[PDB]
PDB file of N, CA and C in Angstrom:
ATOM      1  N   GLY A   1      41.362  -8.602 -95.736  1.00  0.00           N
ATOM      2  CA  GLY A   1      41.723  -7.228 -95.260  1.00  0.00           C
ATOM      3  C   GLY A   1      41.036  -6.132 -96.053  1.00  0.00           C
ATOM      4  N   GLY A   2      41.827  -5.189 -96.560  1.00  0.00           N
ATOM      5  CA  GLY A   2      41.272  -4.086 -97.321  1.00  0.00           C
ATOM      6  C   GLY A   2      40.727  -3.067 -96.347  1.00  0.00           C
ATOM      7  N   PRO A   3      39.888  -2.123 -96.799  1.00  0.00           N
ATOM      8  CA  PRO A   3      39.319  -1.101 -95.913  1.00  0.00           C
ATOM      9  C   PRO A   3      38.590  -1.740 -94.719  1.00  0.00           C
ATOM     10  N   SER A   4      38.670  -1.111 -93.545  1.00  0.00           N
ATOM     11  CA  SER A   4      37.999  -1.622 -92.344  1.00  0.00           C
ATOM     12  C   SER A   4      37.200  -0.484 -91.725  1.00  0.00           C
ATOM     13  N   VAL A   5      36.113  -0.822 -91.038  1.00  0.00           N
ATOM     14  CA  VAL A   5      35.244   0.182 -90.431  1.00  0.00           C
ATOM     15  C   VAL A   5      35.094   0.045 -88.916  1.00  0.00           C
ATOM     16  N   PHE A   6      35.202   1.176 -88.216  1.00  0.00           N
ATOM     17  CA  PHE A   6      35.073   1.217 -86.758  1.00  0.00           C
ATOM     18  C   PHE A   6      34.089   2.320 -86.387  1.00  0.00           C
ATOM     19  N   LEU A   7      33.229   2.054 -85.415  1.00  0.00           N
ATOM     20  CA  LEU A   7      32.206   3.021 -85.031  1.00  0.00           C
ATOM     21  C   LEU A   7      32.303   3.338 -83.544  1.00  0.00           C
ATOM     22  N   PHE A   8      32.361   4.629 -83.209  1.00  0.00           N
ATOM     23  CA  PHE A   8      32.491   5.073 -81.822  1.00  0.00           C
ATOM     24  C   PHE A   8      31.314   5.862 -81.259  1.00  0.00           C
ATOM     25  N   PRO A   9      30.995   5.646 -79.970  1.00  0.00           N
ATOM     26  CA  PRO A   9      29.892   6.332 -79.295  1.00  0.00           C
ATOM     27  C   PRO A   9      30.276   7.769 -78.957  1.00  0.00           C
ATOM     28  N   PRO A  10      29.312   8.566 -78.483  1.00  0.00           N
ATOM     29  CA  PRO A  10      29.607   9.954 -78.124  1.00  0.00           C
ATOM     30  C   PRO A  10      30.338   9.984 -76.785  1.00  0.00           C
ATOM     31  N   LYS A  11      30.948  11.116 -76.441  1.00  0.00           N
ATOM     32  CA  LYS A  11      31.609  11.195 -75.146  1.00  0.00           C
ATOM     33  C   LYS A  11      30.454  11.166 -74.150  1.00  0.00           C
ATOM     34  N   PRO A  12      30.553  10.339 -73.102  1.00  0.00           N
ATOM     35  CA  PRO A  12      29.485  10.238 -72.102  1.00  0.00           C
ATOM     36  C   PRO A  12      28.989  11.584 -71.609  1.00  0.00           C
ATOM     37  N   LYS A  13      29.923  12.479 -71.314  1.00  0.00           N
ATOM     38  CA  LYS A  13      29.535  13.789 -70.821  1.00  0.00           C
ATOM     39  C   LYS A  13      28.747  14.608 -71.837  1.00  0.00           C
ATOM     40  N   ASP A  14      29.071  14.477 -73.123  1.00  0.00           N
ATOM     41  CA  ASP A  14      28.342  15.217 -74.152  1.00  0.00           C
ATOM     42  C   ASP A  14      26.853  14.884 -74.148  1.00  0.00           C
ATOM     43  N   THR A  15      26.518  13.631 -73.850  1.00  0.00           N
ATOM     44  CA  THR A  15      25.123  13.188 -73.838  1.00  0.00           C
ATOM     45  C   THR A  15      24.347  13.660 -72.609  1.00  0.00           C
ATOM     46  N   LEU A  16      25.070  14.062 -71.563  1.00  0.00           N
ATOM     47  CA  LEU A  16      24.453  14.489 -70.303  1.00  0.00           C
ATOM     48  C   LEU A  16      24.256  15.988 -70.093  1.00  0.00           C
ATOM     49  N   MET A  17      24.810  16.799 -70.985  1.00  0.00           N
ATOM     50  CA  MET A  17      24.669  18.255 -70.892  1.00  0.00           C
ATOM     51  C   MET A  17      24.097  18.758 -72.222  1.00  0.00           C
ATOM     52  N   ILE A  18      22.914  19.368 -72.189  1.00  0.00           N
ATOM     53  CA  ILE A  18      22.279  19.865 -73.406  1.00  0.00           C
ATOM     54  C   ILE A  18      23.150  20.883 -74.145  1.00  0.00           C
ATOM     55  N   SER A  19      24.002  21.586 -73.402  1.00  0.00           N
ATOM     56  CA  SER A  19      24.889  22.582 -73.991  1.00  0.00           C
ATOM     57  C   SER A  19      26.025  21.949 -74.793  1.00  0.00           C
ATOM     58  N   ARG A  20      26.265  20.656 -74.573  1.00  0.00           N
ATOM     59  CA  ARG A  20      27.320  19.937 -75.279  1.00  0.00           C
ATOM     60  C   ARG A  20      26.736  19.316 -76.540  1.00  0.00           C
ATOM     61  N   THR A  21      27.608  18.919 -77.456  1.00  0.00           N
ATOM     62  CA  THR A  21      27.151  18.314 -78.695  1.00  0.00           C
ATOM     63  C   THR A  21      27.703  16.902 -78.855  1.00  0.00           C
ATOM     64  N   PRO A  22      26.855  15.886 -78.629  1.00  0.00           N
ATOM     65  CA  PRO A  22      27.274  14.487 -78.758  1.00  0.00           C
ATOM     66  C   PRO A  22      27.281  14.065 -80.228  1.00  0.00           C
ATOM     67  N   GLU A  23      28.265  13.259 -80.609  1.00  0.00           N
ATOM     68  CA  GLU A  23      28.389  12.807 -81.993  1.00  0.00           C
ATOM     69  C   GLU A  23      28.824  11.348 -82.023  1.00  0.00           C
ATOM     70  N   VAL A  24      28.363  10.615 -83.030  1.00  0.00           N
ATOM     71  CA  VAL A  24      28.760   9.229 -83.211  1.00  0.00           C
ATOM     72  C   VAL A  24      29.768   9.327 -84.356  1.00  0.00           C
ATOM     73  N   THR A  25      30.896   8.640 -84.228  1.00  0.00           N
ATOM     74  CA  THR A  25      31.938   8.723 -85.245  1.00  0.00           C
ATOM     75  C   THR A  25      32.248   7.427 -85.992  1.00  0.00           C
ATOM     76  N   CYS A  26      32.228   7.498 -87.320  1.00  0.00           N
ATOM     77  CA  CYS A  26      32.521   6.336 -88.155  1.00  0.00           C
ATOM     78  C   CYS A  26      33.891   6.527 -88.801  1.00  0.00           C
ATOM     79  N   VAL A  27      34.811   5.615 -88.506  1.00  0.00           N
ATOM     80  CA  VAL A  27      36.170   5.672 -89.034  1.00  0.00           C
ATOM     81  C   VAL A  27      36.437   4.541 -90.018  1.00  0.00           C
ATOM     82  N   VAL A  28      36.981   4.885 -91.176  1.00  0.00           N
ATOM     83  CA  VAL A  28      37.325   3.896 -92.188  1.00  0.00           C
ATOM     84  C   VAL A  28      38.834   3.960 -92.383  1.00  0.00           C
ATOM     85  N   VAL A  29      39.507   2.832 -92.192  1.00  0.00           N
ATOM     86  CA  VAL A  29      40.957   2.802 -92.339  1.00  0.00           C
ATOM     87  C   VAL A  29      41.378   1.917 -93.502  1.00  0.00           C
ATOM     88  N   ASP A  30      42.624   2.093 -93.935  1.00  0.00           N
ATOM     89  CA  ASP A  30      43.199   1.336 -95.039  1.00  0.00           C
ATOM     90  C   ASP A  30      42.458   1.526 -96.357  1.00  0.00           C
ATOM     91  N   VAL A  31      42.090   2.771 -96.627  1.00  0.00           N
ATOM     92  CA  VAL A  31      41.422   3.116 -97.869  1.00  0.00           C
ATOM     93  C   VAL A  31      42.579   3.326 -98.829  1.00  0.00           C
ATOM     94  N   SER A  32      42.571   2.623 -99.959  1.00  0.00           N
ATOM     95  CA  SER A  32      43.681   2.720-100.913  1.00  0.00           C
ATOM     96  C   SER A  32      43.779   4.011-101.720  1.00  0.00           C
ATOM     97  N   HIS A  33      44.983   4.283-102.216  1.00  0.00           N
ATOM     98  CA  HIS A  33      45.240   5.466-103.030  1.00  0.00           C
ATOM     99  C   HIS A  33      44.582   5.344-104.399  1.00  0.00           C
ATOM    100  N   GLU A  34      44.458   4.113-104.899  1.00  0.00           N
ATOM    101  CA  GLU A  34      43.850   3.855-106.208  1.00  0.00           C
ATOM    102  C   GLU A  34      42.337   4.057-106.201  1.00  0.00           C
ATOM    103  N   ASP A  35      41.705   3.760-105.074  1.00  0.00           N
ATOM    104  CA  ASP A  35      40.261   3.925-104.946  1.00  0.00           C
ATOM    105  C   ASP A  35      40.024   4.658-103.645  1.00  0.00           C
ATOM    106  N   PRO A  36      40.304   5.965-103.631  1.00  0.00           N
ATOM    107  CA  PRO A  36      40.146   6.821-102.456  1.00  0.00           C
ATOM    108  C   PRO A  36      38.728   7.241-102.078  1.00  0.00           C
ATOM    109  N   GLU A  37      37.786   7.118-103.003  1.00  0.00           N
ATOM    110  CA  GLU A  37      36.426   7.531-102.698  1.00  0.00           C
ATOM    111  C   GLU A  37      35.712   6.597-101.741  1.00  0.00           C
ATOM    112  N   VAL A  38      35.053   7.190-100.754  1.00  0.00           N
ATOM    113  CA  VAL A  38      34.304   6.441 -99.761  1.00  0.00           C
ATOM    114  C   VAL A  38      32.952   7.106 -99.618  1.00  0.00           C
ATOM    115  N   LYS A  39      31.911   6.293 -99.583  1.00  0.00           N
ATOM    116  CA  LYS A  39      30.579   6.823 -99.430  1.00  0.00           C
ATOM    117  C   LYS A  39      30.025   6.337 -98.096  1.00  0.00           C
ATOM    118  N   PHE A  40      29.431   7.249 -97.337  1.00  0.00           N
ATOM    119  CA  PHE A  40      28.846   6.904 -96.050  1.00  0.00           C
ATOM    120  C   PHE A  40      27.334   7.044 -96.112  1.00  0.00           C
ATOM    121  N   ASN A  41      26.638   6.102 -95.488  1.00  0.00           N
ATOM    122  CA  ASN A  41      25.184   6.137 -95.391  1.00  0.00           C
ATOM    123  C   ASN A  41      24.893   5.884 -93.915  1.00  0.00           C
ATOM    124  N   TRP A  42      24.134   6.765 -93.282  1.00  0.00           N
ATOM    125  CA  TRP A  42      23.817   6.607 -91.861  1.00  0.00           C
ATOM    126  C   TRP A  42      22.338   6.366 -91.625  1.00  0.00           C
ATOM    127  N   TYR A  43      22.021   5.563 -90.613  1.00  0.00           N
ATOM    128  CA  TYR A  43      20.636   5.266 -90.262  1.00  0.00           C
ATOM    129  C   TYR A  43      20.465   5.346 -88.742  1.00  0.00           C
ATOM    130  N   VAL A  44      19.301   5.795 -88.295  1.00  0.00           N
ATOM    131  CA  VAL A  44      19.005   5.891 -86.871  1.00  0.00           C
ATOM    132  C   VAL A  44      17.746   5.056 -86.671  1.00  0.00           C
ATOM    133  N   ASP A  45      17.898   3.913 -86.012  1.00  0.00           N
ATOM    134  CA  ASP A  45      16.797   2.983 -85.800  1.00  0.00           C
ATOM    135  C   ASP A  45      16.237   2.589 -87.168  1.00  0.00           C
ATOM    136  N   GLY A  46      17.135   2.455 -88.137  1.00  0.00           N
ATOM    137  CA  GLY A  46      16.734   2.050 -89.469  1.00  0.00           C
ATOM    138  C   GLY A  46      16.368   3.162 -90.424  1.00  0.00           C
ATOM    139  N   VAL A  47      16.165   4.367 -89.910  1.00  0.00           N
ATOM    140  CA  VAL A  47      15.806   5.487 -90.769  1.00  0.00           C
ATOM    141  C   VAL A  47      17.041   6.238 -91.240  1.00  0.00           C
ATOM    142  N   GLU A  48      17.266   6.250 -92.548  1.00  0.00           N
ATOM    143  CA  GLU A  48      18.430   6.953 -93.065  1.00  0.00           C
ATOM    144  C   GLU A  48      18.374   8.443 -92.775  1.00  0.00           C
ATOM    145  N   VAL A  49      19.500   8.996 -92.325  1.00  0.00           N
ATOM    146  CA  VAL A  49      19.608  10.424 -92.041  1.00  0.00           C
ATOM    147  C   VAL A  49      20.719  11.013 -92.911  1.00  0.00           C
ATOM    148  N   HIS A  50      20.703  12.327 -93.108  1.00  0.00           N
ATOM    149  CA  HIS A  50      21.702  12.953 -93.961  1.00  0.00           C
ATOM    150  C   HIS A  50      22.478  14.102 -93.352  1.00  0.00           C
ATOM    151  N   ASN A  51      22.542  14.179 -92.029  1.00  0.00           N
ATOM    152  CA  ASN A  51      23.268  15.280 -91.407  1.00  0.00           C
ATOM    153  C   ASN A  51      24.725  14.958 -91.089  1.00  0.00           C
ATOM    154  N   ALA A  52      25.194  13.789 -91.509  1.00  0.00           N
ATOM    155  CA  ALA A  52      26.579  13.402 -91.254  1.00  0.00           C
ATOM    156  C   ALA A  52      27.522  14.304 -92.048  1.00  0.00           C
ATOM    157  N   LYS A  53      28.716  14.542 -91.507  1.00  0.00           N
ATOM    158  CA  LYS A  53      29.727  15.370 -92.162  1.00  0.00           C
ATOM    159  C   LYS A  53      31.024  14.574 -92.314  1.00  0.00           C
ATOM    160  N   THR A  54      31.571  14.532 -93.521  1.00  0.00           N
ATOM    161  CA  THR A  54      32.808  13.788 -93.754  1.00  0.00           C
ATOM    162  C   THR A  54      34.060  14.646 -93.584  1.00  0.00           C
ATOM    163  N   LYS A  55      35.085  14.079 -92.957  1.00  0.00           N
ATOM    164  CA  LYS A  55      36.337  14.796 -92.760  1.00  0.00           C
ATOM    165  C   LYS A  55      37.228  14.513 -93.963  1.00  0.00           C
ATOM    166  N   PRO A  56      38.131  15.446 -94.300  1.00  0.00           N
ATOM    167  CA  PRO A  56      39.031  15.256 -95.439  1.00  0.00           C
ATOM    168  C   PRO A  56      39.920  14.038 -95.198  1.00  0.00           C
ATOM    169  N   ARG A  57      40.181  13.266 -96.249  1.00  0.00           N
ATOM    170  CA  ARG A  57      41.018  12.075 -96.142  1.00  0.00           C
ATOM    171  C   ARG A  57      42.350  12.434 -95.493  1.00  0.00           C
ATOM    172  N   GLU A  58      42.902  11.500 -94.724  1.00  0.00           N
ATOM    173  CA  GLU A  58      44.186  11.732 -94.069  1.00  0.00           C
ATOM    174  C   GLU A  58      45.170  10.626 -94.427  1.00  0.00           C
ATOM    175  N   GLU A  59      46.308  11.024 -94.989  1.00  0.00           N
ATOM    176  CA  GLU A  59      47.341  10.078 -95.369  1.00  0.00           C
ATOM    177  C   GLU A  59      47.868   9.396 -94.114  1.00  0.00           C
ATOM    178  N   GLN A  60      48.095   8.090 -94.197  1.00  0.00           N
ATOM    179  CA  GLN A  60      48.606   7.340 -93.062  1.00  0.00           C
ATOM    180  C   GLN A  60      50.017   6.832 -93.330  1.00  0.00           C
ATOM    181  N   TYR A  61      50.727   6.384 -92.267  1.00  0.00           N
ATOM    182  CA  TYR A  61      52.092   5.881 -92.380  1.00  0.00           C
ATOM    183  C   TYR A  61      52.259   4.745 -93.391  1.00  0.00           C
ATOM    184  N   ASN A  62      51.190   3.957 -93.586  1.00  0.00           N
ATOM    185  CA  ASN A  62      51.273   2.831 -94.509  1.00  0.00           C
ATOM    186  C   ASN A  62      50.850   3.151 -95.945  1.00  0.00           C
ATOM    187  N   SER A  63      50.769   4.435 -96.273  1.00  0.00           N
ATOM    188  CA  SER A  63      50.408   4.912 -97.602  1.00  0.00           C
ATOM    189  C   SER A  63      48.960   4.599 -98.009  1.00  0.00           C
ATOM    190  N   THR A  64      48.034   4.699 -97.058  1.00  0.00           N
ATOM    191  CA  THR A  64      46.614   4.508 -97.317  1.00  0.00           C
ATOM    192  C   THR A  64      45.945   5.691 -96.700  1.00  0.00           C
ATOM    193  N   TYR A  65      44.628   5.795 -96.837  1.00  0.00           N
ATOM    194  CA  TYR A  65      43.911   6.921 -96.258  1.00  0.00           C
ATOM    195  C   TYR A  65      43.015   6.489 -95.125  1.00  0.00           C
ATOM    196  N   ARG A  66      42.755   7.433 -94.231  1.00  0.00           N
ATOM    197  CA  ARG A  66      41.852   7.268 -93.098  1.00  0.00           C
ATOM    198  C   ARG A  66      40.753   8.279 -93.363  1.00  0.00           C
ATOM    199  N   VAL A  67      39.531   7.826 -93.453  1.00  0.00           N
ATOM    200  CA  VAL A  67      38.424   8.726 -93.731  1.00  0.00           C
ATOM    201  C   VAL A  67      37.417   8.599 -92.612  1.00  0.00           C
ATOM    202  N   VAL A  68      37.040   9.734 -92.043  1.00  0.00           N
ATOM    203  CA  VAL A  68      36.108   9.763 -90.928  1.00  0.00           C
ATOM    204  C   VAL A  68      34.824  10.523 -91.236  1.00  0.00           C
ATOM    205  N   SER A  69      33.694  10.006 -90.757  1.00  0.00           N
ATOM    206  CA  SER A  69      32.407  10.675 -90.938  1.00  0.00           C
ATOM    207  C   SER A  69      31.823  10.862 -89.540  1.00  0.00           C
ATOM    208  N   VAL A  70      31.356  12.069 -89.233  1.00  0.00           N
ATOM    209  CA  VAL A  70      30.808  12.367 -87.908  1.00  0.00           C
ATOM    210  C   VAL A  70      29.319  12.712 -87.954  1.00  0.00           C
ATOM    211  N   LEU A  71      28.538  12.062 -87.096  1.00  0.00           N
ATOM    212  CA  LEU A  71      27.099  12.285 -87.048  1.00  0.00           C
ATOM    213  C   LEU A  71      26.634  12.822 -85.712  1.00  0.00           C
ATOM    214  N   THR A  72      26.110  14.044 -85.715  1.00  0.00           N
ATOM    215  CA  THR A  72      25.596  14.651 -84.496  1.00  0.00           C
ATOM    216  C   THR A  72      24.340  13.887 -84.114  1.00  0.00           C
ATOM    217  N   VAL A  73      24.159  13.629 -82.826  1.00  0.00           N
ATOM    218  CA  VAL A  73      22.972  12.916 -82.389  1.00  0.00           C
ATOM    219  C   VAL A  73      22.168  13.699 -81.362  1.00  0.00           C
ATOM    220  N   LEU A  74      20.890  13.363 -81.242  1.00  0.00           N
ATOM    221  CA  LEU A  74      20.016  14.023 -80.283  1.00  0.00           C
ATOM    222  C   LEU A  74      20.281  13.356 -78.930  1.00  0.00           C
ATOM    223  N   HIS A  75      20.656  14.149 -77.924  1.00  0.00           N
ATOM    224  CA  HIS A  75      20.945  13.619 -76.591  1.00  0.00           C
ATOM    225  C   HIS A  75      19.946  12.542 -76.192  1.00  0.00           C
ATOM    226  N   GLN A  76      18.671  12.884 -76.335  1.00  0.00           N
ATOM    227  CA  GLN A  76      17.548  12.019 -75.994  1.00  0.00           C
ATOM    228  C   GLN A  76      17.615  10.699 -76.765  1.00  0.00           C
ATOM    229  N   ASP A  77      17.813  10.798 -78.074  1.00  0.00           N
ATOM    230  CA  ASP A  77      17.902   9.627 -78.941  1.00  0.00           C
ATOM    231  C   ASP A  77      18.939   8.625 -78.456  1.00  0.00           C
ATOM    232  N   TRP A  78      20.124   9.115 -78.113  1.00  0.00           N
ATOM    233  CA  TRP A  78      21.183   8.234 -77.642  1.00  0.00           C
ATOM    234  C   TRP A  78      20.853   7.626 -76.280  1.00  0.00           C
ATOM    235  N   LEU A  79      20.440   8.465 -75.335  1.00  0.00           N
ATOM    236  CA  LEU A  79      20.109   7.994 -73.994  1.00  0.00           C
ATOM    237  C   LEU A  79      18.954   6.992 -73.997  1.00  0.00           C
ATOM    238  N   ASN A  80      18.047   7.141 -74.954  1.00  0.00           N
ATOM    239  CA  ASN A  80      16.901   6.244 -75.072  1.00  0.00           C
ATOM    240  C   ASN A  80      17.281   4.924 -75.751  1.00  0.00           C
ATOM    241  N   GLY A  81      18.514   4.831 -76.225  1.00  0.00           N
ATOM    242  CA  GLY A  81      18.968   3.599 -76.842  1.00  0.00           C
ATOM    243  C   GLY A  81      18.709   3.416 -78.323  1.00  0.00           C
ATOM    244  N   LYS A  82      18.473   4.504 -79.046  1.00  0.00           N
ATOM    245  CA  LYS A  82      18.255   4.374 -80.476  1.00  0.00           C
ATOM    246  C   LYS A  82      19.544   3.812 -81.053  1.00  0.00           C
ATOM    247  N   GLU A  83      19.401   3.064 -82.138  1.00  0.00           N
ATOM    248  CA  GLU A  83      20.495   2.380 -82.810  1.00  0.00           C
ATOM    249  C   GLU A  83      21.076   3.168 -83.976  1.00  0.00           C
ATOM    250  N   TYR A  84      22.399   3.305 -84.008  1.00  0.00           N
ATOM    251  CA  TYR A  84      23.057   4.053 -85.078  1.00  0.00           C
ATOM    252  C   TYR A  84      23.874   3.152 -85.997  1.00  0.00           C
ATOM    253  N   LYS A  85      23.565   3.198 -87.289  1.00  0.00           N
ATOM    254  CA  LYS A  85      24.253   2.368 -88.269  1.00  0.00           C
ATOM    255  C   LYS A  85      25.048   3.151 -89.309  1.00  0.00           C
ATOM    256  N   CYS A  86      26.314   2.785 -89.490  1.00  0.00           N
ATOM    257  CA  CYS A  86      27.158   3.437 -90.486  1.00  0.00           C
ATOM    258  C   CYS A  86      27.458   2.403 -91.559  1.00  0.00           C
ATOM    259  N   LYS A  87      27.097   2.714 -92.798  1.00  0.00           N
ATOM    260  CA  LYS A  87      27.334   1.808 -93.916  1.00  0.00           C
ATOM    261  C   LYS A  87      28.385   2.467 -94.792  1.00  0.00           C
ATOM    262  N   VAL A  88      29.471   1.744 -95.046  1.00  0.00           N
ATOM    263  CA  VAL A  88      30.591   2.242 -95.828  1.00  0.00           C
ATOM    264  C   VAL A  88      30.760   1.542 -97.169  1.00  0.00           C
ATOM    265  N   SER A  89      30.843   2.337 -98.230  1.00  0.00           N
ATOM    266  CA  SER A  89      31.010   1.815 -99.577  1.00  0.00           C
ATOM    267  C   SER A  89      32.338   2.295-100.155  1.00  0.00           C
ATOM    268  N   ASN A  90      33.035   1.403-100.851  1.00  0.00           N
ATOM    269  CA  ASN A  90      34.313   1.712-101.488  1.00  0.00           C
ATOM    270  C   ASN A  90      34.544   0.729-102.637  1.00  0.00           C
ATOM    271  N   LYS A  91      35.209   1.183-103.699  1.00  0.00           N
ATOM    272  CA  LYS A  91      35.454   0.339-104.879  1.00  0.00           C
ATOM    273  C   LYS A  91      36.147  -0.982-104.598  1.00  0.00           C
ATOM    274  N   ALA A  92      37.043  -0.987-103.617  1.00  0.00           N
ATOM    275  CA  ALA A  92      37.784  -2.192-103.265  1.00  0.00           C
ATOM    276  C   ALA A  92      36.977  -3.182-102.423  1.00  0.00           C
ATOM    277  N   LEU A  93      35.772  -2.786-102.031  1.00  0.00           N
ATOM    278  CA  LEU A  93      34.921  -3.644-101.212  1.00  0.00           C
ATOM    279  C   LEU A  93      33.916  -4.435-102.043  1.00  0.00           C
ATOM    280  N   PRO A  94      33.941  -5.772-101.934  1.00  0.00           N
ATOM    281  CA  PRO A  94      33.007  -6.605-102.696  1.00  0.00           C
ATOM    282  C   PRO A  94      31.566  -6.230-102.365  1.00  0.00           C
ATOM    283  N   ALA A  95      31.375  -5.648-101.181  1.00  0.00           N
ATOM    284  CA  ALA A  95      30.066  -5.202-100.716  1.00  0.00           C
ATOM    285  C   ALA A  95      30.238  -4.154 -99.613  1.00  0.00           C
ATOM    286  N   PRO A  96      29.221  -3.306 -99.389  1.00  0.00           N
ATOM    287  CA  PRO A  96      29.372  -2.297 -98.334  1.00  0.00           C
ATOM    288  C   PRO A  96      29.546  -2.936 -96.956  1.00  0.00           C
ATOM    289  N   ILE A  97      30.269  -2.252 -96.076  1.00  0.00           N
ATOM    290  CA  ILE A  97      30.479  -2.729 -94.710  1.00  0.00           C
ATOM    291  C   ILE A  97      29.588  -1.891 -93.809  1.00  0.00           C
ATOM    292  N   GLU A  98      28.872  -2.524 -92.886  1.00  0.00           N
ATOM    293  CA  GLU A  98      28.017  -1.765 -91.991  1.00  0.00           C
ATOM    294  C   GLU A  98      28.252  -2.114 -90.530  1.00  0.00           C
ATOM    295  N   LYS A  99      28.283  -1.087 -89.682  1.00  0.00           N
ATOM    296  CA  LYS A  99      28.485  -1.277 -88.247  1.00  0.00           C
ATOM    297  C   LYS A  99      27.350  -0.595 -87.519  1.00  0.00           C
ATOM    298  N   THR A 100      26.971  -1.140 -86.372  1.00  0.00           N
ATOM    299  CA  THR A 100      25.889  -0.561 -85.590  1.00  0.00           C
ATOM    300  C   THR A 100      26.349  -0.320 -84.162  1.00  0.00           C
ATOM    301  N   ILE A 101      25.856   0.741 -83.548  1.00  0.00           N
ATOM    302  CA  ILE A 101      26.224   1.021 -82.169  1.00  0.00           C
ATOM    303  C   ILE A 101      25.049   1.684 -81.472  1.00  0.00           C
ATOM    304  N   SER A 102      24.928   1.458 -80.171  1.00  0.00           N
ATOM    305  CA  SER A 102      23.867   2.065 -79.375  1.00  0.00           C
ATOM    306  C   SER A 102      24.353   2.050 -77.937  1.00  0.00           C
ATOM    307  N   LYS A 103      23.693   2.795 -77.064  1.00  0.00           N
ATOM    308  CA  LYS A 103      24.136   2.816 -75.685  1.00  0.00           C
ATOM    309  C   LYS A 103      23.976   1.447 -75.049  1.00  0.00           C
ATOM    310  N   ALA A 104      22.994   0.685 -75.523  1.00  0.00           N
ATOM    311  CA  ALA A 104      22.708  -0.641 -74.977  1.00  0.00           C
ATOM    312  C   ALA A 104      23.668  -1.751 -75.400  1.00  0.00           C
ATOM    313  N   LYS A 105      24.374  -1.574 -76.508  1.00  0.00           N
ATOM    314  CA  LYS A 105      25.286  -2.626 -76.937  1.00  0.00           C
ATOM    315  C   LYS A 105      26.513  -2.101 -77.652  1.00  0.00           C
ATOM    316  N   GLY A 106      26.291  -1.365 -78.731  1.00  0.00           N
ATOM    317  CA  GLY A 106      27.406  -0.815 -79.474  1.00  0.00           C
ATOM    318  C   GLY A 106      28.145  -1.832 -80.317  1.00  0.00           C
ATOM    319  N   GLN A 107      29.432  -1.569 -80.541  1.00  0.00           N
ATOM    320  CA  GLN A 107      30.267  -2.447 -81.347  1.00  0.00           C
ATOM    321  C   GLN A 107      29.819  -2.387 -82.800  1.00  0.00           C
TER     322      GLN A 107
END
């Protein structure tokens, strides 16, 4: 168990209207109170990017934290099937956890 990572695609409509802003969201749950720091590293088709924004930790019913990082994406990039990777680091993790998502597969 310990911290877990989930990655979500942009809202379909956001990717279809240039006026909208599509974002890929990385959620980390069960982050402990003893080791609350979480580091996020994002990559697009393998290229690390730094425009991701982290949300303030949120206390959960089970006395752990939920930490979310949001990455704005280029409409074109997503529609073309570029791959988005979120790598999560935390003291309680023997190694960083990484998830990948794209319009073609996701998960």
